[PDB]
Structures are given as C-alpha cells and as structure tokens.
Design a protein around this ligand. Structure first.
Ligand SMILES: OC[C@H](CC1CC1)Nc1ncnc2[nH]ccc12
Ligand SMILES: [Cl-]
Length: 167
C-alpha cells in the first residue's frame, strides 16, 4: 500500500491520472520523481522547467555541478540526483526529443531506467515539448516498465484520450 490517490489502474503495475506532477510530488513526497530531462540537465521548460522552478532553482544548481563533473547524459540514459523539496530522489531520464531529430526507438531504453526503482511518480517520456506521440509513449511505458509507475498527465484533454484509446 502507498499514498498515491485517484489513479486509474491500466495494468498490474501502471497507473495514470490527470495531474500536475509538481503538485502531486509536493503532496505525496514520493521516493522517486522522474524528470523529463535533456542530456545537459538544462531544466528550461515542460516538466523539467516546472520541477526546477518548484525547487527554487536548487535542482539546476545541483545539475550544473553534476554535468561539470560527469559530462552530459546519453539519450536514453538517466542519473539519480536529489529530489529536493519534492521527493527523496529525482531520476532524470532523457527520452528522445523528436523536435531534435532523435531516434524514437530510444524511448524504450529511456523507460528501462524506471526498472531500477520499485515505485516512481513519472511523466510520459518524450511527450509534450519533446514532440513524440503520447499514445505511443504510454504503450512503450506499459510494455517496458515492470516496476510500479504512477503516471501524471498534465493535459486534461490528453488524459481522456489516453484512457479512452488504451488497449
Ligand atoms: O509528456 C509530458 C507532459 C506533456 C504535455 C502536457 C505538456 N508534460 C507534463 N506532464 C505532467 N506534469 C507536468 N507539469 C509540467 C509539465 C508537465
Ligand atoms: Cl512538456
């Protein structure tokens, strides 16, 4: 039993809700919140900009030190950093950005990072400003993630389409 509330159950392990991931994280304080990161951990917009803003830029400060030490992530890769005031940990995961021409096949590799964590609050990877089809992202999530994932989402209209079209 966990403290996630109001989610629709899609499969044994995947749950979904129309919600603002910032507000969800602040309420639940999950062990792991997933950020929709880029390889430079530059948290400008979308989920990343919103999460970073909620940390008063502490996420960006920590991220800049991470990059200075380790260099950029790989598309499809991830790193674990602090969750600041939002969660114990933040798993920064880089899905392919279609608006940069990146290979959508890398979306499965991106979701594989979730399997290293028993429970996660997460957005749909590569959706929103990353330019992928969210119906596809949800399908890849369900077919790749085996741990317990709580998908937040932001767009109410999009949520209804994802539910009604789910196979
Ligand atoms: O595919 C991720 C999704 C995509 C379209 C809704 C823009 N973005 C978000 N999902 C959940 N919470 C969020 N908070 C801020 C942004 C955000
Ligand atoms: Cl977005």
């Amino acid at each position: 039993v966990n403290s996630f509330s109001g989610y629709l159950k899609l499969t044994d392990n995947v749950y979904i809700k129309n919600a603002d991931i910032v507000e969800e994280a602040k309420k639940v304080k999950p062990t792991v919140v997933v950020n929709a990161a880029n390889v430079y951990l530059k948290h400008g917009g979308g989920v990343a900009g919103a999460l970073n803003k909620a940390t008063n830029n502490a996420m960006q400060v920590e991220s800049d030190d991470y990059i200075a030490t380790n260099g950029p992530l790989k598309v499809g890769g991830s790193c674990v950093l602090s969750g600041h005031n939002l969660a114990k940990h933040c798993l920064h995961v880089v899905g392919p950005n279609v608006n940069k021409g990146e290979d959508i096949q890398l979306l499965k590799s991106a979701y594989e990072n979730f399997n290293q964590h028993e429970v996660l609050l997460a957005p749909l990877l590569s959706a929103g400003i990353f330019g992928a089809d969210p119906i596809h992202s949800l399908r890849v999530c369900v077919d790749t993630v085996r741990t317990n994932v709580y998908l937040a989402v932001f767009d109410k209209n999009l949520y209804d389409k994802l539910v009604s079209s789910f196979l």
